[PDB]
Amino acid sequence: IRLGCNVSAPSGVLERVKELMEDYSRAPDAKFQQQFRHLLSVNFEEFVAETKERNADLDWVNPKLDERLQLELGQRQLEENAKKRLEARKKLPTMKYADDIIQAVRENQVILIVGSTGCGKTTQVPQILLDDAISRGCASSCRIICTQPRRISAIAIAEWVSYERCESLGNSVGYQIRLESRKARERASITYCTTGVLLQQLQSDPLMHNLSVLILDEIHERSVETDLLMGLLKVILPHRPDLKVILMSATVREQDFCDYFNNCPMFRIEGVMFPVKMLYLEDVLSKTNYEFQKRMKHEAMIEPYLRRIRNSYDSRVLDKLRLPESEGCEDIDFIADLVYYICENEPEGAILVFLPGYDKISQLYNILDKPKTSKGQRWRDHMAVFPLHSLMQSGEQQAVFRRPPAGQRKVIISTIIAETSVTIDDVVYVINSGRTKATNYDIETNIQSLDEVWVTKANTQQRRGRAGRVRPGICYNLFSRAREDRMDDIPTPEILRSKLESIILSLKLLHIDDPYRFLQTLINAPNPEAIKMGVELLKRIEALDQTGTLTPLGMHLAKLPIDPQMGKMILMSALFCCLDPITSAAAALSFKSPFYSPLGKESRVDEIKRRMARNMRSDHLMVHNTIIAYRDSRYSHAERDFCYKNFLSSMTLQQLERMKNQFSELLYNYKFLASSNCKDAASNKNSEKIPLLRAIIGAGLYPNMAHLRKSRRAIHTMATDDGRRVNFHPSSVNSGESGFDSAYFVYFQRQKSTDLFLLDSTMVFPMALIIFGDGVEAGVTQNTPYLCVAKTYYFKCNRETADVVIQLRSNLEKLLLKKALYPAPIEENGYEKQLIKAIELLLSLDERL
DNA sequence: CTCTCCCT
């Protein structure tokens, strides 16, 4: 036990904390509390009965609207204005199977439609079933929900299907994503929505009574949500015989889902794509004749292969395959040569280069842009070269989509983002490195890492398809087919890679109280060690009690669309009147930072963040400062130049501001805020007290703590509270700085790459962790009285301050408990405000003087 | 001294 700095408080401050605490203890209605005790008192089939009565609207049909919609669909098939496409929709493969699809849906609760790119299943199946129900005179009983993984998919498909009905968005076709919607009409309608939207609507309608048809699309990508959703359908569908489910999948281990749902009817629908030829490293090197210069294992893999292909390739190319450098992206000059090769031979078309991450996208960009070779010098002026990365601006502009200037060849250097999420349509050539970056979770070390790995067979399959979009393509794989046969079928499904605290809490609102029993039902069961690690986190932040049951605060956290830790941070910000900054922090950790990382500009983007951090040693208040400055630039009509000068995405900032408005609207409806405007003066009376903002941020990121011991840009000897040595991620404002007021930090995410890095952090003060943390005891270790937090960090503290802090933590726990059970805004002159004022007083002693 | 990427 090595004691830290002295946290004792002046006697004058302790007396007034005492005057204030015992004002608070002199104190003497609830719809939320009755909702909470009802949920805990009912068993599961009481739960089923109650939610059936409460969501009954589809029990009502509208015969006159049935017959009217049936009658202008009958006639409005008789123009030629919506026909040109009915004969154009008939040219899509899915339409040939209309009646079999219709008939299979009537005879089966669940069917599966499997099909490759271009088959038309997403756009055509919803209309096939909708137009059938209208024609049978069932229009008003038909409400179809179609889920998509990505937001932009939902809007684009909705807009395109509505074009296909000669309607504007909002009649028979709509979309719903989070924070934006164009809703269809209530009945005889199709809604495209993101999977999360549907999961959140499950909290009000846990048996899906408010739709007649559920279409789950792209289940083969095995996102958490569709895996959860199929898991829940096994619970829901027994109580919903009228409900129709259509699963939709690419041809990627499709049989997993057929098996998972008994064995249900499976339709296979042929795609529409032009042929794309696949070449491997042998083939590429036999064409380019490039020469390399400047464990094995690998040799165990390659030599059997080179003996089986001995007579199909020249010996000198098979010898290059014995170098480990020859496969993947380890030699960027090799990729550069094959780019130059495609520009010389081969017809007109764009090159799509798949590389795992930012670092070597940078290297190939610089080699094409500042060429080392005469061949490169040659081709420099005839290429328009686009890096494509989530942290880069290229996808936010339209150049990378349009066709190049005449005489110029387009070269796209991208991450995995161009496999599905972003799509360039004039690509005829894919150079596939076979390498990506992926996150994996070591359950035993509690270390998250980001490592470069080989892609899966499904990845290359989809990357191959990216070339066949306008015209027959070529896919160059920078690895041998021996490496291909050592690749996994599909990536490890993300629910085995994921923190489960949010999911487990959400399942309590669906009256699924055993996460063990339920998660074991998934197609891929998560490690039960991860399930109690999630349970244990929820117990610590007190969303569950020790027996495992939902607490009143846990019910609030499950109803907030954010991870429970930051939801807790968000509610504290209401109680403590700093709503705007803390919601700024939560939305950014919950989504992403507004800053780009444009090629070559890092030293300069590093310097913008340090100026936006306003020397506050917090990545989280850096984002809030960024948002304050962004609002000022709109209020100044300077928005474009502001974003330019500071390498900011105005589209990221706009979405952060709507999440902030949404957190503010939810907290208002839950009766925690007097106003729904997250900028409201009453909600922000402390938003400029920096020590108080460190306290609320720490309350949410607790227990992720780190301690620095070090003086010198500077190097850092720092370690997390589990003893592991960490460093600030070089993208953090805190990396390399010296002279912190405090050696203590909280962080949202630690990650291993070159080193174990803290990706975001706020400098915190010991009294703040002590008040809002746990594991707090007073004692004596040498002959020095101490106060500790988490039974880890011990601070010199005199008995009078120790005792008052311990009394203070007790009434805070009583206060939080009643705000959870009886939500009200803290009234500014009442008794609860006096214990708020006690805490601000103590925290304000750490102000930078 | 470094950054796979969806989503309520």
- Distance, CA of A769 to CA of A775 (rounded, Å): 10
Beta bridge mates, A177: A180
Residues A428 and A304 in one domain: yes
Task: Kindly provide the b/e burial profile for residues A167-182, where b requires at least 16 CB atoms within 10 angstroms of the residue's own CB.
Answer: eebbebbbbbbbeebb
- Distance, CA of A407 to CA of A49 (rounded, Å): 69
A712 sits within 7 Å of strand B by its CB: no
Residues A115 and A260 in one domain: yes
Which residues of A in 102-161 have their CB below 7 Å from strand B's atoms?
Answer: 149-152
A752 sits within 7 Å of strand B by its CB: no
Distances from the Cα of A689 to the Cα of A65, A576, A693, A747, A848, angstroms: 59, 11, 6, 20, 11
Residues A281 and A292 in one domain: yes
CA angle A171, A176, A178 (to 5 degrees): 155
Residues A331 and A406 in one domain: yes
Q: Which domain holds residue A413?
A: 273-491
Residues A194 and A290 in one domain: no
CB A845 within 8 A of CB A767: yes
Experimental method: X-ray
If we measure between CA atoms, which residue out of A511, A434, A532 comes closest to residue A478?
Answer: A434
- Distance, CA of A171 to CA of A60 (rounded, Å): 20
For the record, the structure tokens of A611 come out as 């100026």
A200 sits within 7 Å of strand B by its CB: yes
Domain finish residue from A550, A574, A596 = A550
The counts of H helices and E strands in chain A are: 34, 27
Which ranges in A636-745 belong to alpha helices (H)? Answer: 639-645, 650-669, 690-701
Beta bridge mates, A796: A6, A786
- Distance, CA of A474 to CA of A485 (rounded, Å): 20
If we measure between CA atoms, which residue out of A14, A1, A12, A3 comes closest to residue A799?
Answer: A14
Residues A71 and A21 in one domain: no
CB A806 within 8 A of CB A17: no
φ/ψ of residue A301, rounded to 5: -80, -40
- Distance, CA of A364 to CA of A347 (rounded, Å): 23
Domain finish residue from A272, A304, A338 = A272
Q: What is the CA radius of gyration of chain A?
A: 30
For the record, the structure tokens of A553 come out as 């605060």
- Distance, CA of A118 to CA of A462 (rounded, Å): 13
Residues A232 and A367 in one domain: no
A359 sits within 7 Å of strand B by its CB: yes
Residues sharing a CB contact under 8 Å with residue A101, sequence separation 6 or more, in sequence order: A94, A111, A113, A125, A128, A129, A267
Task: Write the DSSP assignment of A514-536 as a string of letters.
Answer: -HHHHHTTSSSPPPHHHHHHHHH
**Which bases along strand B come within 7 Å of a protein CB atom?**
1-8
- Distance, CA of A58 to CA of A61 (rounded, Å): 7
A221 sits within 7 Å of strand B by its CB: no
Find the nucleotide nearest A361 (Cα to C1′): B3
CA angle A365, A367, A370 (to 5 degrees): 100
Find the nucleotide nearest A422 (Cα to C1′): B5
Residues A8 and A39 in one domain: no
For CA atoms A34, A37, A39, A41, give the dihedral sign: negative
Are β-strands A756-758 and A705-708 bridged in parallel, bridged antiparallel, or unpaired?
Answer: unpaired
Residues A183 and A198 in one domain: yes
- What domain count does chain A have? 4
Residues A405 and A545 in one domain: no
CB A392 within 8 A of CB A597: yes
**Amino acid at residue number A814:** K
This structure's resolution (Å) is 2.6
For CA atoms A436, A437, A442, A445, give the dihedral sign: positive
- Distance, CA of A607 to CA of A610 (rounded, Å): 5
Is the N-terminal amide bond of A703 cis, ω within 30° of 0?
yes
- Distance, CA of A504 to CA of A513 (rounded, Å): 8
Residues A722 and A759 in one domain: yes
Which residues of A in 720-739 have their CB below 7 Å from strand B's atoms?
Answer: 729-731, 735-736
- The residue lying closest to nucleotide B2, measuring its CA against C1', is A730
A607 sits within 7 Å of strand B by its CB: no
- Residue A843: burial class (beta carbons within 10 Å; 0-12, 13-18, 19+): buried
Residues A499 and A467 in one domain: no
Domain finish residue from A525, A550, A575 = A550
